[PDB]
Amino acid sequence: STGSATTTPIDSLDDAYITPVQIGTPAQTLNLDFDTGSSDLWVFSSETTASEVDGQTIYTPSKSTTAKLLSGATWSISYGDGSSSSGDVYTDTVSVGGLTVTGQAVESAKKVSSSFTEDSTIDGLLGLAFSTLNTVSPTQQKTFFDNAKASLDSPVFTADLGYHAPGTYNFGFIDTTAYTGSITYTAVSTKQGFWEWTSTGYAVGSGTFKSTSIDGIADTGTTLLYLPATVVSAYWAQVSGAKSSSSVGGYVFPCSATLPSFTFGVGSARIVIPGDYIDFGPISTGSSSCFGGIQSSAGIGINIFGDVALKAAFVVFNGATTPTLGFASK
Numbered sequence: 001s002t003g004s005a006t007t008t009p010i011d012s013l014d015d016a017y018i019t020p021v022q023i024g025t026p027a028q029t030l031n032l033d034f035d036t037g038s039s040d041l042w043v044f045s046s047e048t049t050a051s052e053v054d055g056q057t058i059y060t061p062s063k064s065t066t067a068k069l070l071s072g073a074t075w076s077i078s079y080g081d082g083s084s085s086s087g088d089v090y091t092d093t094v095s096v097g098g099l100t101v102t103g104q105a106v107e108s109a110k111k112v113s114s115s116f117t118e119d120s121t122i123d124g125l126l127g128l129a130f131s132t133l134n135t136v137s138p139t140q141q142k143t144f145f146d147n148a149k150a151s152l153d154s155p156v157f158t159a160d161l162g163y164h165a166p167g168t169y170n171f172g173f174i175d176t177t178a179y180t181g182s183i184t185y186t187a188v189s190t191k192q193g194f195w196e197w198t199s200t201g202y203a204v205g206s207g208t209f210k211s212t213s214i215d216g217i218a219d220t221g222t223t224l225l226y227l228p229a230t231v232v233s234a235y236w237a238q239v240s241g242a243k244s245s246s247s248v249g250g251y252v253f254p255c256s257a258t259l260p261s262f263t264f265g266v267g268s269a270r271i272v273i274p275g276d277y278i279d280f281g282p283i284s285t286g287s288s289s290c291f292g293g294i295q296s297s298a299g300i301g302i303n304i305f306g307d308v309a310l311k312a313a314f315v316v317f318n319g320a321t322t323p324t325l326g327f328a329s330k
């Protein structure tokens with residue numbers, strides 16, 4: 001089997017991407033944030049505290065003929081940005097882009113933190129990191145990918161995120177029309193439950209490539225590119241008037257600037273992030289200070305290749321017995 005679904009930016013900045021997901025019988029379609037950095041599939045629901053729901057579409061298990069309570073199971077998650085949610089668990093039929101899993105754990109939110117409430121465009125998360133990070137207790141649950149895998153034509157999914165445009169998540173096949181050149185594969189460590197890999201270096205603009213190992217995670221659920229402070233300083237030093245602002249919470253730059261590109265290495269291959277991708281616009285409405293898309297990972301404890309980096313590539317998440325990542329230009 002295979003599946004193919006379009007993923008759409010939630011806003012003009014590509015802060016996140018939403019993908020429609022069918023849950024239950026008859027189908028209830030919810031727009032979920034697919035997250036290669038976490039391992040829970042959780043939704044706004046008929047159980048979510050009413051004051052914490054503001055415009056999201058909810059899953060109502062009582063209207064699904066295939067929903068069953070997973071008795072005794074609870075979940076609670078805390079993300080890198082401080083957001084969180086928690087609740088109880090159903091099993092139900094879940095379909096993505098025509099690929100169906102029966103008996104998927106669908107984590108029903110009883111509580112969501114204010115960042116979730118405030119964002120009416122995200123109806124929940126679909127985690128695509130390793131199932132070792134799933135938070136269901138007392139019986140840990142599998143991701144949608146892990147449950148689909150044995151049915152798939154090839155044990156893979158691909159992320160093809162758009163810049164200010166829709167893109168695609170495919171399951172079970174590699175669309176050879178969706179990228180240019182060849183795919184370069186690189187080793188993955190699963191020891192922290194992430195798609196963790198080592199970039200071979202970077203370049204700023206038309207500058208020389210610096211060979212240096214940068215461990216980090218491929219995270220579709222993080223907006224920005226978080227890299228070591230040395231690398232980030234070297235990037236922003238090439239932008240007139242850029243500075244790190246403790247008041248704003250990262251590097252800002254004059255909105256009048258033209259940003260240089262940023263290149264990262266994948267083995268001997270190179271992925272170029274155009275300068276425009278690194279513009280996250282005014283820090284507040286009408287400001288002439290703009291927020292940068294490359295930020296320091298100091299204090300996060302890991303480097304994160306978030307959407308800024310991933311959207312510049314066609315990315316293969318190879319879930320074979322020995323997982324690997326692939327990157328191609330597009």
Ligand SMILES: CC[C@@H](N)c1ccccc1O
Nearest residue numbers: 015016081083115116119
């Ligand atoms: C990434 C979109 C943003 N409005 C957001 C939405 C929900 C939870 C956290 C969070 O930062």
Ligand code: NA
Nearest residue numbers: 015280283291
């Ligand atoms: Na923000």
